[PDB]
Amino acid sequence: VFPTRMTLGLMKTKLKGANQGYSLLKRKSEALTKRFRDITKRIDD
Amino acid sequence: YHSQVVGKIGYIARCMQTIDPENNLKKIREDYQDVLIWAEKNYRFEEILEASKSGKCPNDLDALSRRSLILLELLRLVSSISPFKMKLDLIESQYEKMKQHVNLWKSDYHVKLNQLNQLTDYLKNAAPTPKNNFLRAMTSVLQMQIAQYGITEDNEGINQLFKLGLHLLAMANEKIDEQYHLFKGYVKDQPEESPFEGILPAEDQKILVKTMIDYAMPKLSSKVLQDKLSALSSSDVLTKTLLDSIDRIV
Amino acid sequence: AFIILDEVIKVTNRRVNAIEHVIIPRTENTIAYINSELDELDREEFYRLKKVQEKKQNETAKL
Amino acid sequence: NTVSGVNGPLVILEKVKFPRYNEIVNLTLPDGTVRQGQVLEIRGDRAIVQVFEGTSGIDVKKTTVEFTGESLRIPVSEDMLGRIFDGSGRPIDNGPKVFAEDYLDINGSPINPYARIYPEEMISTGVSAIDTMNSIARGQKIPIFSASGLPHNEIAAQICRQAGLVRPTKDVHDGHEENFSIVFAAMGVNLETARFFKQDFEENGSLERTSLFLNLANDPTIERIITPRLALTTAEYLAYQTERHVLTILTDMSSYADALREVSAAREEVPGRRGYPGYMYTDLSTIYERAGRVEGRNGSITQIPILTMPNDDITHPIPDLTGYITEGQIFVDRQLHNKGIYPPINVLPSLSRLMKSAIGEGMTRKDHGDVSNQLYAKYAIGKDAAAMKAVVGEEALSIEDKLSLEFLEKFEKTFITQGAYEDRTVFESLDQAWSLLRIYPKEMLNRISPKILDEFY
Amino acid sequence: NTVSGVNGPLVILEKVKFPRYNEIVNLTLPDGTVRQGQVLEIRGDRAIVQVFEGTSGIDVKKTTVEFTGESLRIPVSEDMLGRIFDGSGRPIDNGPKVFAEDYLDINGSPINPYARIYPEEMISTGVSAIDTMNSIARGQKIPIFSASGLPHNEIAAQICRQAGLVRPTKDVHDGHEENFSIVFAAMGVNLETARFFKQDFEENGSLERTSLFLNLANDPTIERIITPRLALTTAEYLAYQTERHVLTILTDMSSYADALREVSAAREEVPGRRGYPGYMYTDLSTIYERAGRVEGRNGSITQIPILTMPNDDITHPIPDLTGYITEGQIFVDRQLHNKGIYPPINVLPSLSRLMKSAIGEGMTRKDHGDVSNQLYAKYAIGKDAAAMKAVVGEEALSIEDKLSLEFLEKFEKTFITQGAYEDRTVFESLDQAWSLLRIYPKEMLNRISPKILDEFY
Amino acid sequence: YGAIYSVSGPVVIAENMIGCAMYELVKVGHDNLVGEVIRIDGDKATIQVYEETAGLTVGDPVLRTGKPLSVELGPGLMETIYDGIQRPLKAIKEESQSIYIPRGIDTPALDRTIKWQFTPGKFQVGDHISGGDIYGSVFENSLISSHKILLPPRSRGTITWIAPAGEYTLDEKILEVEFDGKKSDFTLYHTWPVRVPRPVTEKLSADYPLLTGQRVLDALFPCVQGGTTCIPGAFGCGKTVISQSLSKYSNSDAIIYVGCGERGNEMAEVLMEFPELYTEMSGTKEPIMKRTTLVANTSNMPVAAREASIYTGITLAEYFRDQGKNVSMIADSSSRWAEALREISGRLGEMPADQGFPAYLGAKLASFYERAGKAVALGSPDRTGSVSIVAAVSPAGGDFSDPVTTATLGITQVFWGLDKKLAQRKHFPSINTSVSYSKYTNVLNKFYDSNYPEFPVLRDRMKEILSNAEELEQVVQLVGKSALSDSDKITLDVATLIKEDFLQQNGYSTYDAFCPIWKTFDMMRAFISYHDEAQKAVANGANWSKLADSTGDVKHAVSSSKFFEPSRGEKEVHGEFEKLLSTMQERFAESTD
């Protein structure tokens, strides 16, 4: 149902924005877990 | 190719012969002796085209267009300053200053002469009105100051008169209050008492003083003020004391 | 603050895993499918144009 | 004179070029049946003619040809309304004939009835969302774009009956200053949809004042494209001769483009982009040329083309080629019909550049075009917040995403929600559309002036 | 003497088969204007050739034909600098002739001089980021990839104008011990860009060392496609016969690709995918076959092609075919050019595959290899810290993201920022990059040696 | 002479044609239809007609006139609307009874009944003349009298007969020139080929700016009189309002409007809207119609008039530039001319190489952009002229992968962006800061340094803030609104007011008739000073709500300052710009403290 002529231009920028948002969410989740481990150990102590 | 060079050499010789008809400018005609030498002799056009095609005459379209633009700017500046006459040394100094310029077609000197010729060209076909009379007097004072000071020296009166002429020309036919206020404000701020004696007609100063007295006369309501305003409107000079006395009486 | 970070970490990991897991293959397959359909349409147009130009070459060769 | 060859559905006859181009020819076969055809292309010592009555029965050298000597012209009169005709002008019941009193061309080039004037009289189609966002005037060739998998013929016939039923209330508002006429052109349509459109036209009260043209998929391709030129010539001759606003419906355009694409597959011609013919824009421009206000400022011919998207994309050669010549567009949505919104019409990709010229004071509102700019941005922001809310989640939305998501659901189910026989005025559509916009504050709208927005806010 | 017809840019004339392929021909028309061209094909009393000046306006049975008897070749000489020429080897200054001394072919390779030496002895051309991080040498090629969002013609004119000034400062460093020349080729450019580039190159004082080739956009495609062959043969003849380092700049590749795609409209050859021809690899290989180190390397023939993408898509064989033959690629970002930086080149996606071979000892800096990797890692860490700084915020940003973010903003306006009339060498670019890299500590710097890092901090 | 060999569609072929050129026009058939042989194949020539033929048979007589097909150059072009083939539709509307191009009728482009006042120049009998020289002058309108009657190009000789000043028609002789024997007589009208461009003496650099009235268009890229600029289309988003508002808002001496593939309603609305509207030059008695040249070509007409409409408009713009006046050429759209060339190639039978379009469409489309530009006027007088090439591009395929936009993007020198999402949101005319380029900004910066303009310094910061606003909005919408600095919020807040004041136009502002350079340059100084004052106040220590509440009436006054005219206080600067400079220090000092 997508356009056959000149349709990959929006999908390339959408895939690049989704990859950049997935990388930023992965880095924010990694920093959130890295702070969450020391917060869990300090909460236990 | 060769027809544009032959026509540019003939138009350059006609513009050079029409620039100085007395032969008193040896400096301007001295630089154009290579093109005026072939035009001052009775020869055929085929001999000039064959001589130009064989490298025996001037055939540079860029140099002939630049020299024809400088000579057309000097002849347009000398013709645009009528009926006044410029100095003989001022034409050679303006031609020497325009010849040494890097870009004469991109400077403000060509736009000032183009706007000065466009003001008189637009005012010549236009009917007689107050904005055409004030723009005609400002174009006459700008033509006298432009002919006296040249186009190689800056001046605030030429730029203010050109800006007032462009602003008055850009206005519509329903802005007589802004043209009368701009003419009264520009005339009141002038250093001279009256810039119309010997440059304008005698009926133009009485028509301008009668136009200002008729414009300020409809706001008065006393008999003494209408009698003094009607008695002050019979002067053949546009002085600042008449405008200050008319503004103080209103 | 520990319960807030522990509450936000599951939503961030689930959103990053779901978006990173579901993001690439739809446009990645659709772009190659649209490019393959455009290339097949261009080759089908040129293959029909060559047969039309072949008659014009033989007709123009006689002149 | 004699059949030289046959390639596909077209018959190539060999004879001298005595007859002109587009003139009707007479072909006689040795079976006791005569057929008539028109020369689509003229050549030296050969001619390509398409037979209207069938495509079988040609002979190699046992047939004869006769030149009529007259060009292809359809006789138009002021009494042809209220009769049943075909794509070639013949009846299917042996009743009423042509009865023409004037000679008109099949292309409309020799008349040129389009006066130098834009569309001013706004014709209401009975839809608040259709006439509100993309409202056109009399003479605009903006057609309704559709797609596969949805009943676009029932929505087109319902909008056609709603325009004629809404024309009586709009006649007093100065929207229409003449009579109402309907033009029904069929090309590749079923008998049930043609009988339903004829039943809707007879129920609307236009059966005795309209012309019916029938063209099926089993007929020739030249008759289907020839029927819209005769219908547009009769509507342009009646609208120019009587000064009446005539509305012509040309459906379907995909069958007319498929007939022109099928006509190029039997000759030696270079094909264009997407495997289609290169001269389809010139043939499509001739049908769209017969449109606009008539000379006099009292009549105009309106054309509403029905184009169905086969691939569900606007980048096709048929929808893009016909949409490039026309101004504006109105695209339907299958998600609106699947959700329950009747009629389903989307407002995000549909935009017209002549809505300001068709609109005007005295027959509409001043802020109707200003409200569509904020409604389009709120509709796009509602789709972006709806896609971001489902894609990313409910923990990544902003404050404007909730109001845009509620305004998109309220506007999608409030403005586009209506019946199939209830008329909707422009003032009721603007009053009902202005109430749906009040969901946010006055510091979030910037597609309208504050003077006109403060007076109606 | 008898023109058969004309179809597109190629004219079909009827003449004898005595003329060879690629032979010059003079077409005399009845208007009074003589135009020269090249014979595209020779057959048995039939041929199709492309005229250099115009493609229409000749008679079919009134024009005259004449053969010069010489093949298509341009005279190569050492006096080609300081003048303006055309795409067919004709001067447009209206002055003296070429006065060459050797006959070099323009449609093929005369001797095909290509030495088998590795790439070494790198020289700069005026780009700090281009010559620093992806600096190429004599023998290797590096193309520039741009799009429709930046002045790529002004970037090629500034890159060609920046060359020649680094030879005096590089001569003291043992980087250039001979005469340096530049090859300027313009295809599909306007008179304002050619006059502005000629006045800009003449204002800096580099017009006496480079050649000017101006090709208009209203000429035939044979002259635009044959315009770089005279620059490649002039650079190969000047580099081989004179033993001097010459740099060749060819812009734009999109005009040569569109001119090559517009050709072959009346032959048996058909284009490939995307509308372009399938022989673009042989066309780019023919231009790439006349550049590089000649046998007996004393000078160098550097090829720096500038290609501008009209759509910015990666589905075309123009950037992939041009980048596949070369070693490396340079990309330009529209966001860097929109901010005001000139040139707006990015060092993140750009990389050099032969950067270590081009740099050595005695003709380049020692820490230029580690400084480019440290600047690239600091630019990537500055881009990641700048991207994570918006999500993390200002009060929760890390010290490494702020220190790398300040080095990215300071390095983006200091290293990439250059003057239009200023020439910066690689030694000044390394000293400018050392000042931006001096903000980081010594413990956070591990991409260089300790002696070079302690000596240059 | 010739016979009709085949007739298919709007193009007719004629065999037995020997000795004809590739530009000579002849009458096909017995109806005397106008046409021109564009191409030929062997003995049969393919001639495209400017009228839809429906009653012409194969075998009719075809006699060539013996000269090329072009338009007439003389007085009477202004204050009239013609077609793409130089045919007056006003006389054909009343005479032929049709406002479109008729069939089987012939009408000249210049009427022989209209008389004008002709005056001779300073030349006399015996002086040499050349091509494009100023031989006389004729007053065409009552506003501008610079319509000098010049000779045709490629001519030379001496003036043997000189006519005096007075009133005469276009068919009366006023001058005669013969170099070698009696060549021919001269008149007010001149013949010139439409397919052949007008020659010039030399080219000049583009350094004169031209304001079309759009603040976002002139603010995004520097528009100059003599450059090449393209306009992106989307199959209708309000591009006709930018062309009609750009043509009516322009203050040039000449106006060249030529419709290539329009529907016909925009040409009639633009033609009828020109007499009711007023210009900025103090015109009267139809000043908008008398100052511009109207060329009306629709899609319902033949493709020959639509393809020759750009050649007639470029020839009229070359004649107006050779006359000594600057004219602005507005063309829309090039996709209808390229589709007409592809329809002529598909109808004729030529094999294309552009994915359905002709292979020669790229050289013909690229050759049209090289004809326009600023340079010295041809002729012995050496006058100054300029021609602005403004051609809007339309969709003919994909969004950016079309051959008309791809081939036209390389030959152009100025490019403007177009938001596809913002175009459907009712925000036209929109532009893209990432997709844009201009080469005349460096040469225009030198004259701008003498004029003291600050347009490019605020345009670079506005393009940087508009570029960072899309990345901040995309990163905020993608990552989620959970944390952000005050610099991105202040940049998005300045980009919202800058996009609202500069992006919103053609129905979103009160004053849109004239846009001065001082108001546009001084307008960006308030937003750049507010963004730099907010970033400097936030950098030196301050809250975001304290600075946003510290601004107050300055943000609403800066956003509402676009509705006010620049005629308050002074003649070029408003009082809000002077009061905003003094109030910006108090708002920045109060926001920081």
Curated annotation (Swiss-Prot), chain A:
Family per record: Belongs to the V-ATPase D subunit family.
Cell compartment(s), UniProt: Vacuole membrane
Domain of life, source organism: Eukaryota
Function: Subunit of the V1 complex of vacuolar(H+)-ATPase (V-ATPase), a multisubunit enzyme composed of a peripheral complex (V1) that hydrolyzes ATP and a membrane integral complex (V0) that translocates protons. V-ATPase is responsible for acidifying and maintaining the pH of intracellular compartments.
Lineage of source species: Eukaryota, Fungi, Dikarya, Ascomycota, Saccharomycotina
This protein's encoding gene: VMA8
Coiled-coil region(s): none
More info: Present with 8500 molecules/cell in log phase SD medium.
Whole-protein coverage range: 8 to 52 of 256
Self-association state and partner proteins as the record states: V-ATPase is a heteromultimeric enzyme composed of a peripheral catalytic V1 complex (components A to H) attached to an integral membrane V0 proton pore complex (components: a, c, c', c'', d, e, f and VOA1). Interacts with RAV1 and RAV2 components of the RAVE complex, which are essential for the stability and assembly of V-ATPase.
Protein name: V-type proton ATPase subunit D
Curated annotation (Swiss-Prot), chains D, E:
Residues modified as Phosphoserine: 109
Main localization (coarse): membrane
Keyword match Signal: no
GO MF: ATP binding; proton-transporting ATPase activity, rotational mechanism
Subcellular location: Vacuole membrane
A Pfam family of this chain: ATP-synt_VA_C
GO BP annotations listed: ATP metabolic process; endosomal lumen acidification; Golgi lumen acidification; intracellular calcium ion homeostasis; pexophagy; proteasome storage granule assembly; proton transmembrane transport; transmembrane transport
Signal peptide: none
Keyword Phosphoprotein: yes
GO CC terms in record: cytoplasm; cytoplasmic stress granule; fungal-type vacuole membrane; Golgi membrane; membrane raft; proton-transporting V-type ATPase complex; vacuolar proton-transporting V-type ATPase complex; vacuolar proton-transporting V-type ATPase, V1 domain
Protein residues bound to ATP: 353
Cross-referenced PROSITE patterns: ATPASE_ALPHA_BETA
Membrane topology: Peripheral membrane protein
Keywords: ATP-binding, Hydrogen ion transport, Ion transport, Isopeptide bond, Membrane, Nucleotide-binding, Phosphoprotein, Transport, Ubl conjugation, Vacuole
InterPro entries reported for this sequence: ATP-synt_VA_C, ATPase_a/bsu_AS, ATPase_F1/V1/A1_a/bsu_N, ATPase_F1/V1/A1_a/bsu_nucl-bd, ATPase_V1-cplx_bsu, P-loop_NTPase, V-ATPase_su_B/beta
HAMAP family registered for this protein in UniProt: ATP_synth_B_arch
Function: Non-catalytic subunit of the V1 complex of vacuolar(H+)-ATPase (V-ATPase), a multisubunit enzyme composed of a peripheral complex (V1) that hydrolyzes ATP and a membrane integral complex (V0) that translocates protons. V-ATPase is responsible for acidifying and maintaining the pH of intracellular compartments.
Family of this protein: Belongs to the ATPase alpha/beta chains family.
Misc: Present with 131000 molecules/cell in log phase SD medium.
Protein's UniProt name: V-type proton ATPase subunit B
From Swiss-Prot, chain F:
Major subcellular site: membrane
Gene3D superfamilies: 2.40.30.20, 2.40.50.100, Bovine Mitochondrial F1-atpase, Atp Synthase Beta Chain, Chain D, domain 3 (1.10.1140.10), Homing endonucleases (3.10.28.10), P-loop containing nucleotide triphosphate hydrolases (3.40.50.300)
Free-text description of this protein's post-translational modifications in UniProt: This protein undergoes a protein self splicing that involves a post-translational excision of the VDE intervening region (intein) followed by peptide ligation.
Binding site for ATP: 233-240
GO biological process: ATP metabolic process; endosomal lumen acidification; Golgi lumen acidification; intein-mediated protein splicing; intron homing; proton transmembrane transport; vacuolar acidification
InterPro entries cross-referenced by the UniProt entry: ATP-synt_VA_C (IPR055190), ATP-synth_a_Xtn (IPR031686), ATP_synth_asu-like_sf (IPR023366), ATPase_a/bsu_AS (IPR020003), ATPase_F1/V1/A1_a/bsu_N (IPR004100), ATPase_F1/V1/A1_a/bsu_N_sf (IPR036121), ATPase_F1/V1/A1_a/bsu_nucl-bd (IPR000194), ATPase_F1/V1_b/a_C (IPR024034)
Bilayer topology: Peripheral membrane protein
Catalytic activities: ATP + H2O + 4 H(+)(in) = ADP + phosphate + 5 H(+)(out)
In-chain residues carrying the UniProt-annotated modification Phosphothreonine: 107
Taxonomic superkingdom: Eukaryota
Keywords, sorted A to Z: Acetylation, ATP-binding, Autocatalytic cleavage, DNA-binding, Endonuclease, Hydrogen ion transport, Hydrolase, Intron homing, Ion transport, Membrane, Nuclease, Nucleotide-binding, Phosphoprotein, Protein splicing, Translocase, Transport, Vacuole
Residues that bear Phosphoserine: 380, 450
Function: Catalytic subunit of the V1 complex of vacuolar(H+)-ATPase (V-ATPase), a multisubunit enzyme composed of a peripheral complex (V1) that hydrolyzes ATP and a membrane integral complex (V0) that translocates protons. V-ATPase is responsible for acidifying and maintaining the pH of intracellular compartments.
Name assigned to this protein: V-type proton ATPase catalytic subunit A
Record gene name: VMA1
